[PDB]
Scaffold this motif. Sequence first.
Motif, PDB file in Angstrom:
ATOM      1  N   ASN A  43       0.828  -1.201   0.000  1.00 35.31           N
ATOM      2  CA  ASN A  43       0.000   0.000   0.000  1.00 35.31           C
ATOM      3  C   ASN A  43       0.866   1.256   0.000  1.00 35.31           C
ATOM      4  O   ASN A  43       0.364   2.368  -0.162  1.00 35.31           O
ATOM      5  CB  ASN A  43      -0.926   0.005   1.218  1.00 35.31           C
ATOM      6  N   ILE A  44       2.170   1.071   0.181  1.00 36.22           N
ATOM      7  CA  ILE A  44       3.104   2.189   0.200  1.00 36.22           C
ATOM      8  C   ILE A  44       2.846   3.142  -0.962  1.00 36.22           C
ATOM      9  O   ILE A  44       2.229   2.783  -1.966  1.00 36.22           O
ATOM     10  CB  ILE A  44       4.564   1.703   0.136  1.00 36.22           C
ATOM     11  N   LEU A  48       1.807   5.913  -6.589  1.00 35.56           N
ATOM     12  CA  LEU A  48       1.793   7.294  -7.060  1.00 35.56           C
ATOM     13  C   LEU A  48       3.206   7.784  -7.352  1.00 35.56           C
ATOM     14  O   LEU A  48       3.407   8.681  -8.171  1.00 35.56           O
ATOM     15  CB  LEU A  48       1.131   8.200  -6.021  1.00 35.56           C
ATOM     16  N   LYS A  49       4.186   7.188  -6.680  1.00 38.10           N
ATOM     17  CA  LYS A  49       5.582   7.560  -6.869  1.00 38.10           C
ATOM     18  C   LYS A  49       5.817   9.012  -6.464  1.00 38.10           C
ATOM     19  O   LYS A  49       5.478   9.935  -7.204  1.00 38.10           O
ATOM     20  CB  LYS A  49       5.994   7.353  -8.328  1.00 38.10           C
TER      21      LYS A  49
END
Length: 50
Positions: A43-44, A48-49
Amino acid sequence: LQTKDLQQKFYEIILDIEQNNVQGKTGIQQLQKWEDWVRWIGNIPQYLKM
């Protein structure tokens, strides 16, 4: 083409889904379950980066 790429993606979930069995024929399912534990932290903000 549009089918090549479109299917080029889903066609990847077919070879990775079958491995789940090949990595558990000798009673070593954990073989592929090893790093699999990382799935918990899937989920990190890597999607989206930053």
